[PDB]
Structure formats: structure tokens, C-alpha cells
Design an enzyme around this catalytic site. Structure first.
Site, PDB file in Angstrom:
ATOM      1  N   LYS A  17       0.721  -0.705   0.153  1.00  0.00           N
ATOM      2  CA  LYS A  17       0.381  -0.117  -0.096  1.00  0.00           C
ATOM      3  C   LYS A  17       0.924   1.590  -0.056  1.00  0.00           C
ATOM      4  O   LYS A  17       1.725   1.210   0.988  1.00  0.00           O
ATOM      5  CB  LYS A  17      -1.186  -0.138   1.157  1.00  0.00           C
ATOM      6  CG  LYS A  17      -1.463   1.448   1.457  1.00  0.00           C
ATOM      7  CD  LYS A  17      -2.946   0.861   2.544  1.00  0.00           C
ATOM      8  CE  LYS A  17      -4.064   2.469   2.571  1.00  0.00           C
ATOM      9  NZ  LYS A  17      -2.956   3.606   2.344  1.00  0.00           N
ATOM     10  N   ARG A  31       2.229   1.054   3.943  1.00  0.00           N
ATOM     11  CA  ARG A  31       2.293  -0.809   4.653  1.00  0.00           C
ATOM     12  C   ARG A  31       1.839  -1.440   3.681  1.00  0.00           C
ATOM     13  O   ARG A  31       1.417  -1.269   2.335  1.00  0.00           O
ATOM     14  CB  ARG A  31       1.506  -0.981   6.433  1.00  0.00           C
ATOM     15  CG  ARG A  31       0.349  -1.293   5.630  1.00  0.00           C
ATOM     16  CD  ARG A  31      -1.123  -0.666   6.919  1.00  0.00           C
ATOM     17  NE  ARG A  31      -2.531  -0.717   6.495  1.00  0.00           N
ATOM     18  CZ  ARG A  31      -3.240   0.423   5.951  1.00  0.00           C
ATOM     19  NH1 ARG A  31      -2.655   1.484   6.345  1.00  0.00           N
ATOM     20  NH2 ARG A  31      -4.023   0.523   6.051  1.00  0.00           N
ATOM     21  N   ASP A  53     -12.683  13.900   4.829  1.00  0.00           N
ATOM     22  CA  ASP A  53     -11.991  14.295   5.672  1.00  0.00           C
ATOM     23  C   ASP A  53     -10.858  14.907   6.080  1.00  0.00           C
ATOM     24  O   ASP A  53      -9.878  14.161   6.593  1.00  0.00           O
ATOM     25  CB  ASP A  53     -12.200  12.786   5.787  1.00  0.00           C
ATOM     26  CG  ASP A  53     -10.984  12.036   4.403  1.00  0.00           C
ATOM     27  OD1 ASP A  53     -10.641  12.829   3.704  1.00  0.00           O
ATOM     28  OD2 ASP A  53     -10.076  11.180   4.850  1.00  0.00           O
ATOM     29  N   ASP A  90     -14.430   8.466   3.784  1.00  0.00           N
ATOM     30  CA  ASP A  90     -12.904   8.399   3.121  1.00  0.00           C
ATOM     31  C   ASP A  90     -13.400   7.348   1.799  1.00  0.00           C
ATOM     32  O   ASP A  90     -13.412   6.188   0.553  1.00  0.00           O
ATOM     33  CB  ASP A  90     -12.367   6.884   3.497  1.00  0.00           C
ATOM     34  CG  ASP A  90     -11.150   6.546   3.169  1.00  0.00           C
ATOM     35  OD1 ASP A  90     -10.583   7.446   2.287  1.00  0.00           O
ATOM     36  OD2 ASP A  90     -10.440   5.337   3.419  1.00  0.00           O
TER      37      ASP A  90
HETATM   38 CA   LIG Z   1      -1.410   6.238   6.467  1.00  0.00          CA
END
Ligand SMILES: [Ca+2]
Ligand SMILES: [Ca+2]
Ligand SMILES: [Ca+2]
Ligand SMILES: [Ca+2]
Ligand SMILES: [Ca+2]
Ligand SMILES: [Ca+2]
Ligand SMILES: [Ca+2]
Ligand SMILES: [Ca+2]
Ligand SMILES: [Ca+2]
Ligand SMILES: [Ca+2]
Ligand SMILES: [Ca+2]
Ligand SMILES: [Ca+2]
Ligand SMILES: [Ca+2]
Ligand SMILES: [Ca+2]
Ligand SMILES: [Ca+2]
Ligand SMILES: [Ca+2]
Ligand SMILES: [Ca+2]
Ligand SMILES: [Ca+2]
EC number: 3.6.1.1
Lengths: 160, 160, 160, 160, 160, 160
Positions: A17, A31, A53, A90
Site C-alpha cells: 500500500k 504498509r 475528511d 473515505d
Molecule cells: Ca496512512
């Protein structure tokens, strides 16, 4: 017709990611996922946006072949995957390459097969399963109209 | 120490689910998975076995680098992922390469980190989520002793 | 509905042209292409066929992800790329994975976008451009009916 | 001009060392190398040979693009890497694809740049460095004449 | 000896056509090619140039192994592929890595095999075949002298 | 606990040796290695350091999956590979991803298997074997304490 630049952070197929430090523009490893899942589409964020957000608005781009992280792609939206996680809203704008007649048959959310849409949803429903304190809920596909509105809104916040 | 040959059907990282036609030994595409998941380890079956469901006994092999489909790997078991699906018992023997001192620290199920074990489980719990009429339940990690017993049993059925 | 097994010799994306020695079933490198082109689809031949040129009947299989050489894929035809080369008739049956509902929208030649069809044609029109004494002509897309008929015919010759 | 079939076991770039069980023809993982090295060329063995160590005669094939394990390649020799290891003589015949005019400029050992030859040698001198009880010595490049003679010899032993 | 930095936009093997936004230095996806072709060499542009069409001068770099998009490579020219497209002159300077003795045998256009040169030409002659309103003509290989002159010229325009 | 950002220049598995021009931040190809070796770990340098040789301090990062060149990774040190080459001291700090509990079992040099450590050493002992005028000596693994001290020191020099 609305169109914008997506900076792709993650090619389809990846369990790493990747993120961007938005102050520097540098690509960063967030990660390696904890679940045995892979991003179902090229994934990134729309340049010059501030989403609901306070972070840049995220984008999924359908492609015949993945790109590399950091790459810009002119895209137009066709729907959105609305979703809430541990840090709030999100959402993920579903896009196809802008100005490419091979994608002209894809105009709204109904033009994308239910199989791909379910797969994409499944990814976001489960990718954080083994991370404690992270979850996603209110998973919901919405149409292009709502995608464009949320893009518009987030372009304004970026300027304001 | 028990050891046997695993024919790897699926490299770690794959969303294409490969199979063997066991009468011919030919590699076949079973299907492209419907979920955005990838096999968490090299995956195949132990040669000359008939498992508790009348099919060859399945194996997961931990490797520093994946192999190709069709490849044989001498392996020794260290535990098993017990599991039941729509067609009955469908256990997965966890293995490491036999005769390789780099894996000598891995002897029983307790020697494999909980992170890898959870990831492997998560895969099998979810990979069939979007296939109607397919499920998995009774997901349970067991130790080497139980793996060896089930291998032994399945070697006998193959001869009987 | 007609369906059959295709042995894929060449994954989409490849400039190495693989072949099968049909007496042994071994995979062989025919040659690295002389043109900077790559197979536009997974490519192979239908098992147990003898085509109009006394060689096994060739197949193109549309896939979400390529397989490896030697792999079997249950496929059903949706059209055919008729074509003649230096050694005579050398048609290519266009297929999709059989029994996979993700491809149910693809039934006949009209269900495949003109972009993919043109790309496939372009490949076969040009891949041998720089090989002296090799050419292709009479390039023509035909429908499923004609594909099935040619498959049927070639199944009979294999038995006769 | 001499030519023969090489069964490639290992693509260039690989740290997984693949083998063939010669009684079955199955591809097997011998081991993941212990040194951070990768095969410098496609590597395999010449079909129907019994080399000076009672094992099939090994071959290195120069290619513009690697193949997959198990693949056959018609090749012609241009030199040989003579070498002895813990189990005796273990020579490696250097080849190029037979019948491919792109390799017609490569006829004898002097036609291959010293850089490639040194790299190949370096691999075999060092790949077993961290395996105790394994070594290689008497590393020596020889010409096509000596390669052909050793091939010939090993074809006879296979028949005898 | 002339040498310069090439920013590689496209690795050899790619059907994704990458570009640089030269004002930002960002890598962008121009398009996925419409023909089943792949760039025959690493491809990019020479830094600090303004070519005969008011765009940076394009470069092909011969490499033993491709790089990633965005990567800089010190290169020296050995010839040029002169060519005109729908937007005018669009020449491609053929290069090899500067300061690398493995390429010292490649000094001028005659040092590159006709096979590679024909393949490169074929790519540029055909890659735009299925894009309406795009073509290429006046395809012509010229020598290092003419490459250097065109580089020199384009370095001046960039400063002027 | 000490942690810092490593900019990865070279993914594990690579024979292309990538560099950064530190004044621009651009990724550059230094060279394709002359030996048939591949970087044994992701390799780069710690941001904002000036090491004992007046160049940025180099880092090896253990990862479950490699990243791409240019990518930032938050890392914490667990030991160091001390080493001297033709240009002086050229130490390599061994790291694991910071804040990732999957690596919590790796705290000091004794927590990394001797196999990996020997492999890493072997790479640096031999990668320059065929480059004349380049060598490495004084190869020595040291612990985290010494790694941290050398990082600290090099952070100061960067500011001073
Ligand atoms: Ca992050
Ligand atoms: Ca993000
Ligand atoms: Ca969770
Ligand atoms: Ca199975
Ligand atoms: Ca099945
Ligand atoms: Ca299900
Ligand atoms: Ca064929
Ligand atoms: Ca042939
Ligand atoms: Ca021709
Ligand atoms: Ca061998
Ligand atoms: Ca062996
Ligand atoms: Ca040794
Ligand atoms: Ca360009
Ligand atoms: Ca353009
Ligand atoms: Ca055109
Ligand atoms: Ca460096
Ligand atoms: Ca350097
Ligand atoms: Ca040296």
C-alpha cells in the site's frame, strides 16, 4: 464533461500500500497489507482536492494495463464508492481514462459490470480485517452525478 | 522425519486458480478468483494421496520465492489448516522445504508467526465470498502431529 | 452450448512464440518474433482437432489475466479470425472461458469491441512482416456459427 | 552443423534452481540459491545425453528473452564452460538458438564478448560459495570443436 | 565524445505509452497503444533540448535490462531514426550507455545489427496504425554524425 | 526508538544499480552490474545524512515485498554491515519497517538469521569482482548500538 488528473499511487495487483506525502509529492510505503488481498484497480487520488475528511479525494481508475506509482492519468468519473472508516468518510471515485474512445461505453455506474463492482467493494470491506482499530462501513456504490458533485466540492475546499 | 512431494499448482501472489487434471497430470485454469485476493503461499497437493474428501490432499508451502505451476517440491509438514467447504473436508497441510536448513527453525505450528497464519486463514475464509453456493467453515489451525496423521491416512487410501 | 479445451501456448503480452510438439506434448520455443509485437490475447490450440491445414486448430482466449504456457482452459467460441498464410489456411477461433458468468455477455462476434478485434487482426497482419517468405492475407472476422462449424469439422478429421 | 534440443530448466535471472527428475520428466525445485546470485543465461540440459559424470549434459542458451522452465529450444553449440565440482566433471555447453539468423554472427567462443563469458564464469565459480562441501574448480572456457566432441560422446553413452 | 542524460519514459516491452509533463517533470500516461506492439527499446527524451518540432528531442537507449519510467541514463548517440509524423519532424536518437565498456563496440549506426534496426523502424512505422489522423513517413536511419548535429542544434534552441 | 526515512534506490532482485543525484532527487542508472548478482535486499540511503565518506548513509531494508525505486520507507535500524571499498568507508545500515509489529521480533543483529546475513555479505564482497580498481574489504556485521551511533553522527554532519 468533467475530467481531472489522478496520481496513481497503487497499481492493480499490489499488496504493498503506497501513499504520497502531499507536502513533498514523494511516494511512500504506507504498509504491506495484513490481509492476502490485492488492489482491484489502479488506485490513487485526484490532484488539487480536499475531500470530506480533510485529505485528498481518492480515485479508482479502470485500465487495460496498470501504470507505476507516481504516474498521472487524465480521468473522468463514472460513479463513486462511498464508504466510512475509522477516520471518517473515505470515498473512492470510480474513473476511466479521459479522452479514450475505448472507454466511451462506460458513462455511469450502471455501465460497469456487477462482478467488478462487487470485487472492488469486497476489497475495501475486507482489506483492513486484520488491523485492530480499523474497519469500514456504510459501503455503497453511487452514480456519476454524485461523484461529480463530491469532486466539485473538494476542488473548492482545496482553493478555500 | 516425514517428507513428501508437493506439486505446486499456484504460486503465491496469484488470483488465477490453477488445478491439475489428476488422470493426465495437465495443469488447468479452474477460474480467475471472484474476490480481489491472492494465494498467500505457494499452493498445491501432495502426490499419491487421497484425502478425506476423495480428492488429493492439499498443501501450502512456505518459500522464500514462488515457483511455477506444475513444479515439484520436496516438503515436510509443520501443521495443518483444517477446514470444511461446500464439498466437505478440504484441509491444507502447511509445509516448508524438506532438507533445507534455512527452515530448520520451523518445526511445528507454533513456529509460524500468528500474522502469516491469520493471513492464510483469512484467504480461505474469504476467497469464495462472491461465489454463490460456496462457503468455508470450521476453519482451524492444528499442529504437525495431526498433519502427519492425516497425510499418513491419505497415503493409505491412495494405495487401498 | 459448444465448449472445448484450449491448450494455451502463449500468454498475452509475449514476443516469444511458443509451440507444442504434438507427438510429445512438450512446449517448445518456435522463435522470438522479428517484429516488436506481442500476442494480443492468450493463444493456443484446441485439443483433439485437425484443422483445414492438417495442423491443430488455433484459438485465441480472452482472459482477465493471462495463464502460463501448457495450461488447459475450458473455452467456448464466439467468432473466428479467418486468415491464410504461406502454408495455407490458418484460422483462429476466438473464445472466452466456458462456464464463467463474467463472460456471459459475450456470445457472438458483435459482442467483442471493434478496438480489440482490430488489434487482434493488426497483430496477425503484421507479426511476420520481417520474416521473408511469410505473409498473411484474406484476414477476415467471422461469427460464432462459422467458428463452431470449423471446430466440428476439425474434431471429425482428428477422429477420421 | 550440429544442433540439438535443450530443455531449459532455469530462465536467466532466477535464484530458484530448478531440476528435472529425468525418469518422469517433471520439473522440480532443487533449492533456492544460498548466494545472492541469479542464473546469467537460460540454463538446462541437452535431451538424450549422458555426460562425463553419468548425468545429462548441461547447456547454457543465449536468448534475447528468457523462456519458462520445461521449454524445449533447438540450439547449436558455440563453446563450452569446462568445470569440476564436488561430484566431478560438470561441463556447460554454450549455445545459441539453431536456425535463427540473428545469431549467425556467433559461431565460436571468440564471438561471445569477454564480459558475458566472465559473468557466466563468475556465476559458476561463486553460486555454491555458501554451501558447505560444495565447490567448483578447473573453470575453463573451451571452443566449439571441444563442445561438439563432448556432445557427440555423451549422445553415444546415452545409447550405449 | 558527446554524451548526455536521457530521461527514460518507457521501458522496452511496454504497450503503455508514458510521457513527461515537461513543466512539472511528472510522469504521465499518454495512452495504452491501440496496436498490439511494445516499445522495442527503452525510450525517452534528452534533457535540456528543444527539437526540430519545438518538443524535447527523443531518444532510444539500448540496454541489457530495462529501467523504470523517470530514470536518468547517461548516454552517447550512435545514430538516429529520422521520421515525420502528423505533427512534423519527430526524430529518435539511438544511444547506448555512456562510459560503459560493454558498449564500446557500438560506435556508429553500422555497429547495430540490421535486425534490431528493422524492428525499431517497424515499431514506429506501425504503432499508430489504428489511430485515425496519425501516421509516420520519411522513416530513415542516419549515422552518428547526423545524430550529434541534431542534438547540438537542439541544445542551442533550448538555451535560445 | 530510533527511526528514519530510507529512500529505496534498488529493489531486492535487481542487477540494475540505481542511484540518486542528491542535488535534484532524480533517480539515475549507475550501471548494470558486471557480475551475475542481484541486490539481496531493498537498498537505498537514509534521508538527511552525511556518512563517514561524505556521501549519504546507505541502508538495507528487510521487506516482505520489494518497493519501487524512489520510494520512501520509515525504517528502524537493527545492525550494520561495516565495509570499506575503493572510495573508503561505505557502511550499510540494516533496517526493518518502523511501526510494523510483524518485525517486532527483529531488534538486534542476532535476530536476523545467519543465512540472510551471509548472503548480504557475500553480495557486497563480490558484486564488484569484475570491475577493475574496485574492491571491498573489512566486511563486518555490527550491532544496532553501533548502527544508531553512526546514524546519529551522520545526521549531525548533514546539519553541520
Ligand atoms: Ca496512512
Ligand atoms: Ca491515500
Ligand atoms: Ca480491523
Ligand atoms: Ca486442488
Ligand atoms: Ca474445481
Ligand atoms: Ca459464497
Ligand atoms: Ca501453433
Ligand atoms: Ca513452426
Ligand atoms: Ca514477411
Ligand atoms: Ca541439472
Ligand atoms: Ca541436485
Ligand atoms: Ca562451498
Ligand atoms: Ca515524448
Ligand atoms: Ca501526447
Ligand atoms: Ca493511423
Ligand atoms: Ca548510493
Ligand atoms: Ca556512482
Ligand atoms: Ca574488482
Amino acid at each position: 464533461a468533467m475530467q481531472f488528473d489522478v496520481t496513481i499511487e497503487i497499481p492493480k495487483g499490489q499488496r504493498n500500500k503506497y501513499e504520497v506525502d502531499h507536502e513533498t509529492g514523494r511516494v511512500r510505503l504506507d504498509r504491506y497489507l495484513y490481509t492476502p488481498m490485492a488492489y482491484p484497480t489502479d488506485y490513487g487520488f485526484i490532484e488539487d482536492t480536499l475531500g470530506d475528511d480533510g485529505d485528498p479525494l481518492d480515485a479508482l481508475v479502470l485500465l487495460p494495463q496498470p501504470v507505476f506509482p507516481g504516474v498521472l492519468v487524465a480521468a473522468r468519473p463514472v460513479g463513486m464508492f462511498r464508504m466510512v472508516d475509522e477516520h471518517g468518510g473515505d470515498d473512492k471515485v470510480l474513473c476511466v481514462p479521459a479522452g479514450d474512445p475505448r472507454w466511451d461505453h462506460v458513462q455511469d455506474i450502471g455501465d460497469v459490470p456487477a462482478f467488478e463492482l462487487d470485487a472492488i467493494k469486497h476489497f475495501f470491506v475486507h482489506y483492513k480485517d486484520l488491523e485492530p482499530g480499523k474497519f469500514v462501513k456504510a459501503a455503497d456504490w453511487v452514480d456519476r452525478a454524485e461523484a461529480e458533485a463530491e469532486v466539485q466540492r473538494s476542488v473548492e475546499r482545496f482553493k478555500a
